[PDB]
């Protein structure tokens, strides 16, 4: 049905870019449609921070739909922190436009080495209102109210390493994205799209561990203790600091990650968090399982999982839509 899929342009399969637009002159912007956060920001012409010299900086004075605020804010992600000040304007995402309260970053120095070396200009959240800094009603939630799209929900379909594109459809569930079945899980809370799963792969079972489906995380995630015993086996190598372990790809002891909620079980095979590391001898590949510690035992199910199952997000259904992405 009628909607609007925002083509996300993959990068080494560990982050994907979209094409946002702000203001009347429709100032273009390479965004990251992230669900781990619920705030939209763009670097301001006032961003005197180096990692800003190499990108599209928003220019208020060039937009007639630019409303002033100026309240200062911060936003802490895993890759760093950014700071600037509130402003409001007409944001565009494909065939849809809407007046949204967003942020103009002025300070991004904290987001290095990530920012200064990537291609996205800013971030556009997609999480829940109570996770946003400011209690900003979520973009997609908004376009629902204003009777602008079939349903209040978006869709995530990503390619692998390369192969083909990926899309972010806002509104309705495009069925050409998954093969057959589609199951739904409640939510624990309305922050990050989070569920109550029993995460495990080896003999490491954990009850109701918090699992956050995240488009903005490029790696899966378990805490330190839950991983220190990961070397209990897995002759995984630890290349110097950053970004994570690298192992041999024809190994034979790497356990299909098992994620299962009572209603249904989701399984992830090694093939998902491997390779390339080819030119650098094609018999080696990167693990792609980082040790991240949030609050409690929070597991970050990022791309790898979304790389297997085509996902559906809905504020209305108030849950996530899991189902095998269809490599077609």
């Amino acid at each position: 049905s009628e909607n609007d899929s925002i083509e996300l342009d993959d990068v080494a399969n560990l982050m994907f870019y979209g094409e946002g637009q702000i203001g009347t002159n429709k100032q273009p912007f390479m965004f990251i449609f992230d669900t781990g956060s619920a705030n939209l920001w763009v670097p301001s012409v006032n961003c005197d921070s180096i990692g800003c010299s190499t990108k599209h900086l928003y220019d208020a004075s060039a937009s007639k739909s630019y409303e002033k605020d100026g309240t200062k804010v911060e936003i802490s992600y895993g890759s760093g922190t950014v700071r600037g000040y509130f402003s409001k304007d007409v944001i565009s995402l494909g065939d849809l436009s809407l007046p949204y309260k967003f942020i103009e970053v002025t300070d991004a120095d904290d987001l290095e080495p990530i920012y200064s070396g990537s291609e996205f200009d800013g971030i556009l959240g997609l999480g829940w209102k109570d996770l946003s800094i400011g209690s900003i009603d979520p973009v997609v939630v908004e376009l629902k109210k204003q009777n602008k799209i079939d349903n209040a929900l978006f869709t995530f379909y990503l390619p692998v390493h390369d192969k083909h594109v990926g899309y972010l459809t806002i509104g309705g569930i495009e069925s050409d994205f998954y093969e057959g079945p589609l199951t739904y899980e409640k939510l624990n809370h309305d922050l990050y799209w989070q569920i109550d799963l029993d995460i495990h792969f080896g003999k490491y079972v954990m009850q109701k561990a918090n699992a956050v489906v995240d488009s903005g995380t490029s790696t899966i995630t378990a805490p330190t203790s839950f991983l220190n015993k990961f070397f209990r086996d897995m002759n995984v190598i630890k290349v110097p600091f950053l970004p994570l372990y690298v192992t041999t790809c024809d190994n034979d002891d790497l356990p299909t990650l098992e994620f299962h909620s009572r209603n249904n079980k989701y399984t992830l095979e090694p093939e998902f968090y491997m390779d390339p590391l080819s030119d650098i001898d094609p018999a080696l590949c990167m693990l792609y399982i980082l040790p991240v510690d949030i609050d409690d035992n929070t597991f970050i199910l990022g791309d790898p999982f979304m790389r297997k199952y085509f996902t559906v997000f809905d504020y209305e259904k108030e849950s996530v839509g899991f189902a095998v992405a269809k490599n077609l």
Partner: peptide
Amino acid sequence: XVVXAX
């Protein structure tokens, strides 16, 4: 990579 809010 990136691990997008805390």
